[PDB]
Design a protein around this ligand. Structure first.
Ligand SMILES: *[C@@H]1O[C@H](CO)[C@@H](O[C@@H]2O[C@H](CO)[C@@H](O[C@@H]3O[C@H](CO[C@H]4O[C@H](CO)[C@@H](O)[C@H](O)[C@@H]4O)[C@@H](O)[C@H](O[C@H]4O[C@H](CO)[C@@H](O)[C@H](O)[C@@H]4O)[C@@H]3O)[C@H](O)[C@H]2NC(C)=O)[C@H](O)[C@H]1NC(C)=O
Ligand SMILES: *[C@@H]1O[C@H](CO)[C@@H](O[C@@H]2O[C@H](CO)[C@@H](O[C@@H]3O[C@H](CO[C@H]4O[C@H](CO)[C@@H](O)[C@H](O)[C@@H]4O)[C@@H](O)[C@H](O[C@H]4O[C@H](CO)[C@@H](O)[C@H](O)[C@@H]4O)[C@@H]3O)[C@H](O)[C@H]2NC(C)=O)[C@H](O)[C@H]1NC(C)=O
Ligand SMILES: *[C@@H]1O[C@H](CO)[C@@H](O[C@@H]2O[C@H](CO)[C@@H](O[C@@H]3O[C@H](CO[C@H]4O[C@H](CO)[C@@H](O)[C@H](O)[C@@H]4O)[C@@H](O)[C@H](O[C@H]4O[C@H](CO)[C@@H](O)[C@H](O)[C@@H]4O)[C@@H]3O)[C@H](O)[C@H]2NC(C)=O)[C@H](O)[C@H]1NC(C)=O
Ligand SMILES: *[C@@H]1O[C@H](CO)[C@@H](O[C@@H]2O[C@H](CO)[C@@H](O[C@@H]3O[C@H](CO[C@H]4O[C@H](CO)[C@@H](O)[C@H](O)[C@@H]4O)[C@@H](O)[C@H](O[C@H]4O[C@H](CO)[C@@H](O)[C@H](O)[C@@H]4O)[C@@H]3O)[C@H](O)[C@H]2NC(C)=O)[C@H](O)[C@H]1NC(C)=O
Ligand SMILES: *[C@@H]1O[C@H](CO)[C@@H](O[C@@H]2O[C@H](CO)[C@@H](O[C@@H]3O[C@H](CO[C@H]4O[C@H](CO)[C@@H](O)[C@H](O)[C@@H]4O)[C@@H](O)[C@H](O[C@H]4O[C@H](CO)[C@@H](O)[C@H](O)[C@@H]4O)[C@@H]3O)[C@H](O)[C@H]2NC(C)=O)[C@H](O)[C@H]1NC(C)=O
Ligand code: NAG
Ligand code: NAG
Ligand code: NAG
Ligand code: HSM
Lengths: 337, 337, 337, 338, 337
């Protein structure tokens, strides 16, 4: 009668667990059990471009109804100890694209079981998962990624279980509080659907983030040095061929600086082995400075033979190099932006 | 009845544990159980800006009152084996902002259970937690950080549990004994409050450390070599332009060495979106040495056509550049201090 | 009586598990039990030549028949909770060449047990296995690797268990969706056989992939700088010996640059006991630039004595060096392709 | 009565464990139980100054007495399976300053339980632990570190348990067999004491090692190249100002080599706020070579008008610079070595 | 009562485990129980000089006799489930020199229990271990290490347990199939003896391998570039002395390149007190490329005094330096053989 009688509550719980078979899902052999899901994103730790995965920490909550656990005489929600979850049936929900996930267990396992008078069960966990995400890095470092978290029942088909987001589009909270330095979250989407494998149908939930990479750091750290080196190489064009030490020194310095910058950036860039926009841009700048040095060498060679042709070639190079470089850069930016 | 009669003590313990339902909190269905907490910090192992987290080892102790475990006739504090914690109810206290924490287990699980005659239980653990601490590296390496550890009940709301520091501001000890190689703990604070989530009000305790970095390592590591390289670049001014090869070689060598040093230091430093103060200083030094190189090239360009103007430019620069660098350093050390 | 009667299903399951011995294989002492295996490869996480291993995430399903588990009266397939797998006999199937393999356990253990009216048992796991694939890196980065996953029975010989691929060549799915940055899957094969060891004959199932390495990344990042530096070294032949000092620098620069590139590529692959194709190409480029510098030094040695021979040597080199390098590139790209 | 009656031995053991309570220490409520501890060190895997900790593998053995486990009629010592250790009370011994530790469990858990007729229990555990050792590197690489392993009971106070080294100073063996490539173990000390916390008094056993670093590697790695380069830098003084190219080359090469040595030193190093001995030495060498180059530049600036001034400066420097550098080296070695 | 009757075999197995005490070794209080051992080495994953340890995967089989498990009427070798190993007595065999080892547990724990009519028990495991191996790196990389694996009884003395190699020198197989990229296994040895500790005599088995390293990788990696840089230093001798800029640039570049190579090589191995062969050779190469610069400076010092003597000593240097360097290489490669 009185809710304060802990012996009465113990009797009720023992009656609920009396003859309770954890091997059988609720409504076994009947209608599928509907499971609602909530995700409270604590934070996103890292977004690894090298491994193409991201670490996500979240409060994952599942909401279902098992009439076997329905009780009476206690007008309260029984917030039981987490250990009782080992004595109850819980959905075999897993993440399709995770690689290494775990449940935090300090001080105790971060697990919560709440029972309601109508038999409703709420089961909460705190989970850190490293979810894989295939990244299209052709547009790097101006790409926009779409990283997904897929949630699926491992063993129960759609005839036995039906996932759905609990709360419409509000099923996932805390996205706006995510503090990602390198990336910025633009839009998150919730999808509920079914899939069909050789063993039958399966429910599926999907949480998708669209990450827009910040561009200021890359512009201020990778493109401007190469542009400055190209302009410095062009500086040697406007020095007379009477003395060769100045122009040779300028060309050598430009080549060495460009090579060292390329190597240094490659040592602080993702090691994914395929072509990127930044690599093409740097290689184009390298080709431009190499062509400038070639033209200076040819002019120096022919100066002792044909001064008039040397002057004409120098003037035409002064005409061609800047406009050609600007055309190349503008078409590159239009192609990528 | 005597303590020497270990059979009597065993019978008392067995009677305490008989009919003890671990799935219900003390005073279940009634007022919340007040839980006091003590933290005895052993050491802060590391504070990493790459992962933006700090590793902390501590003794975490929880004091609470459980009338079910009250015993009479034995006026002694019963220090039981840690395994008895598997037969007792314990709070589901967890850390809000950790990433990978564990309880040490050599030679046994570092766990302590102490019962008291009035029915009060003390439960102690030794926990090494890697708590995530978002850092504002804007003023690096002259930054001041504030790293917090949050303690919260996972399942039970404020109606079922309440937290408080046991000892006021003296609850957390061992802070002054912490030996951080690269930081100094200016202050620590203790906060007790209640937060609100969709499932209700939850108790919350906060332990905050304000850290200040030590500048000596970076002063003797990055700043002084850069200043020395800048002075070496200046040295070329005091060489006559008749032997231009020596000055050109010195300028090229200084530029290449400064670039290599800056690239290596950048490789050592982590990756953040904005620009660190150390990066700004290195950029300024490289700008100064590059401008010195370009100024010498400009002078040597018209060295013979207008020798008087070249000599005047060199004599002006020999005073202008040190004054400009001193002004830049004054602005730098005034803005960040 | 009713198919949806949970009590009836519980009684049937209890009778199935009552008197069931988990220490004895089905039809113990009789004909061997046949196990049919399906593999659904979700993704290949990474392939590493440093450790010579590949990470594989898959759904591994085993099919067998245990007449002790046959039940009647329920015309449905029982999808039991994964925790029932501990109460049944499961094959001792392991992977012969795995290093660190584990079964995912979030939120629950990624395990599925399905019983059928005729005693048929389907047992599915989600396994992330780091399989050791010995690699031949002689042709690297133009290599074509053959990586296999071996499946064997540990304790039971061919007299107690037999393996076959359920579904023939369609047993292993998901290969078409595998996305590898550095590799492209060419073909996958399934092999079933028996292997003889000192303890008897054991079943063996081999799943082999042939992987082909993409070459665009290495062409853009490694070969192009080498070719450009070699051409820059050639440039010196078009400069008269009157700038003998400056020419030195140019030649020096190339070698210096080459050395830097070599360092950039030094920490890329482990210590193979032979010569990789990329290392051979870099050695060839270094030899070419070194020989160009030696030729210039020889020219400078006799420049004062026999200038006509010096000019003749320069003219000969202008044709020999590009021709020899083109011949070397032709033979290299014919040998490795 | 027959020892070979394995059924009789099983019955005796079951009777010993019948009604046995693992939640109560031996002689609960009476005198504190005395635990004698032995340690057999197998190897110190590594000592890292980056994390300031050392990895240690040992054979931590404990010795106590529990009259509840006293058996009669069998004049033998019962070496039981390790699993029976889960059925007996064991001290809550832990290491005060360990970060990661574990008990090896291949092929079985490396755990040993031996029972004696009087009720005495011997409990062996093969343990690998990474113990944190705070290091003062202000004298690196001449430093002599002191790394301690602490052992303490967790829950029981001194009123419930007491710790003592079994065998006196010979409790810990195998220290001489440790061969650290970098350090050398000068001495090991054993301390038994009691500490006080807000929860009462606790026993404490300290095993301390004094590690003396070997300077042989560093001298032939860092000090010698810097000394050689600084001595080489004096050659620029002997060569007259007329051959300016060679002097410029010597100055540039000395500066570049010193800078590269400094960068390599900073490559293999942890982060500390103070100044280490080798760091100060490299800073001094760099200052000396930089001053030599600056002096040469000044001479080249003024030699165009006063060749006698340049000659006098060179002659004075050829004595001042070596004398100053030797004085700096001598004072450095006096300040650090002794 | 045929062997195919699973009920009879279950009864026999239950009878064997009826009253079996896992806390007592076979023949307790009597003669020691012999335990033969077999090792089937699958692979040696790595041999790292950084940590002075090597990884090893092997099938470890222990073969002994337990008369309490003797059964009759079933003329078959009972291959039981792996979990039955938790209900038997197994030796406490451990590895003396291992650092961290484990038994693979996918899909089940790799563990085989086989019983024979005469009570003989065969117990097999698949173990991956990290065995410590102190390496004498004085002659790196021309060294020849001897790495051992020690097998011992943790608790039982020679009075209770006597180890031996089952099958003599054939007790270890799979040695000839070991694939080490950097090492070649010259020989392996098996030793059986007894070792006296404070608690008495313990049986001991030793499995030793002698590994010889391969030199081609280091010949192509470091020695060849060092020799090339030494010849590059030699280049400056075959040049007219008046070309100060060329020789200065050559000397500076050679010194910088040699120092860069040495620095990029120093990080391979930890701070071993002794000096490796590589270190001695690199120091010698640096000495030669430094004496080249010193000789050039010495010539430039007496350039004004006796230019004829300058040319003569330049020719003598041309004669000497290659000969002295050849002598150095000859003695170096003769000592390390
Ligand atoms: C990152 O990339 C993933 C794909 O890899 C994107 O995921 C897709 O998201 C879109 C929505 O943005 C999904 O489209 C929607 O799918 C719903 C489910 O479809 C299933 O169920 C229906 C029946 O209910 C079947 O007919 C169908 O075949 C599927 O089995 C639909 O209900 C939605 O319909 C809505 O739009 C259509 C028009 O497109 C209207 O006609 C409808 O009336 C309705 O308004 C819709 O089609 C898509 O399914 C997702 N695919 C996958 C594989 O997940 C992420 O969106 C992307 N990230 C971001 C931020 O966009
Ligand atoms: C690192 O950064 C964190 C924040 O990110 C700082 O933490 C904050 O610390 C301050 C105190 O320094 C906290 O402010 C205090 O909050 C208490 C709790 O407030 C709740 O409860 C009260 C009722 O008890 C409600 O009224 C209130 O709405 C909340 O629900 C207050 O009790 C404290 O009151 C004190 O100040 C007020 C005036 O402001 C006085 O009137 C009071 O008498 C009393 O003195 C106080 O307001 C703050 O909540 C913390 N924030 C977080 C997020 O934890 C760390 O301090 C910082 N590190 C360092 C070293 O400073
Ligand atoms: C990577 O490299 C591995 C080797 O290291 C390759 O694996 C081998 O692949 C070949 C096929 O290319 C396999 O050869 C096949 O073996 C089958 C099994 O033979 C066993 O059983 C039969 C009885 O059934 C015995 O007689 C025999 O001795 C063996 O004990 C055969 O059935 C195959 O023959 C079939 O096809 C041929 C035509 O190709 C027909 O003529 C036959 O009638 C029959 O239908 C065949 O001989 C070999 O066993 C594999 N070895 C291992 C260790 O796996 C991988 O293929 C390679 N990777 C890739 C992608 O190719
Ligand atoms: C690394 O650094 C640590 C310290 O940080 C060193 O450890 C110290 O070692 C010394 C011994 O070399 C210890 O000194 C001895 O302590 C004993 C225990 O003290 C307790 O008991 C006494 C009463 O007996 C109490 O008064 C005290 O408060 C403690 O409760 C003492 O019994 C010893 O006494 C001896 O010396 C005194 C004079 O000092 C004589 O009067 C006595 O008769 C007797 O001869 C002694 O004092 C010291 O306690 C240790 N400190 C710590 C913190 O453990 C390591 O030795 C060092 N590493 C190396 C390799 O040296
Ligand atoms: C890597 O390095 C290890 C050592 O660290 C080498 O291992 C040694 O191997 C040799 C054999 O090659 C071992 O020598 C043998 O020791 C056995 C055990 O000796 C104990 O028992 C005997 C009595 O039986 C006592 O007298 C002795 O004191 C020990 O208590 C002996 O039984 C062997 O005797 C055999 O050879 C002798 C001749 O040498 C004959 O007279 C005998 O009849 C018999 O045939 C033998 O002496 C040595 O013990 C091993 N070392 C250790 C520490 O145990 C590895 O060999 C090496 N790797 C390689 C590839 O060589
Ligand atoms: C509380 O429950 C106990 C056990 O069922 C019962 O004996 C007792 O009477 C109950 N209290 C009241 C007030 O009924
Ligand atoms: C062993 O002890 C049991 C129990 O006392 C007894 O029944 C049996 O006869 C004894 N056997 C021998 C051989 O001593
Ligand atoms: C098989 O074993 C059962 C159980 O012991 C027994 O009843 C039956 O008779 C046996 N079968 C035969 C053919 O003996
Ligand atoms: N931290 C209490 C559990 C929770 C928070 N948000 C949602 N559920």
């Amino acid at each position: 009668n009185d809710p304060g009688n802990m012996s009465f509550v113990k009797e009720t719980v023992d009656k609920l667990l009396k003859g309770y078979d954890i091997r059988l899902r609720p409504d076994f052999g009947g209608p599928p059990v509907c499971v609602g899901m909530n995700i409270d994103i604590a934070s996103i730790d890292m977004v690894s471009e090298v491994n193409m995965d991201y670490t996500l920490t979240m409060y994952f909550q599942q909401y279902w109804r098992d009439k076997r656990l329905a009780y009476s005489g206690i007008p309260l929600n029984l917030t039981l100890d987490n250990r009782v979850a080992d004595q109850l049936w819980v959905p075999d929900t897993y993440f399709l694209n995770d690689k290494k996930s775990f449940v935090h267990g300090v001080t105790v396992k971060n697990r919560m079981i709440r029972l309601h008078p109508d038999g409703t069960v709420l089961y909460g966990l705190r989970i850190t998962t490293t979810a894989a995400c295939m990244m299209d890095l052709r547009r790097y470092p101006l790409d926009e990624q779409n990283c997904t978290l897929e949630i699926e029942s491992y063993g129960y088909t759609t005839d036995d279980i039906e996932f759905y987001w609990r709360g419409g589009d509000k099923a996932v909270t805390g996205v706006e509080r995510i503090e990602l330095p390198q990336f910025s979250i633009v839009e998150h989407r919730l999808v509920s659907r079914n899939v069909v494998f050789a063993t039958g149908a399966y429910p599926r939930l999907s949480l998708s983030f669209r990450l827009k990479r910040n561009i200021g750091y890359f512009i201020l750290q990778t493109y401007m040095p190469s542009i400055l080196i190209t302009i410095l190489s062009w500086v040697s064009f406007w020095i007379n061929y009477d003395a060769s030490a100045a122009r040779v020194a300028l060309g050598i310095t430009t080549v060495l600086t460009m090579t060292t910058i390329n190597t240094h950036l490659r040592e602080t860039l993702p090691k994914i082995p395929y072509v990127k926009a930044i690599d093409m841009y740097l290689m184009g700048c390298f080709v431009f400075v190499f062509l400038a040095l070639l033209e200076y060498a040819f002019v120096n060679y022919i100066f002792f033979s044909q001064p008039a042709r040397a002057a004409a070639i120098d003037r035409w190079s002064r005409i061609v190099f800047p406009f050609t470089f600007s055309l190349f850069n503008l078409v590159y930016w239009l192609y990528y932006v």
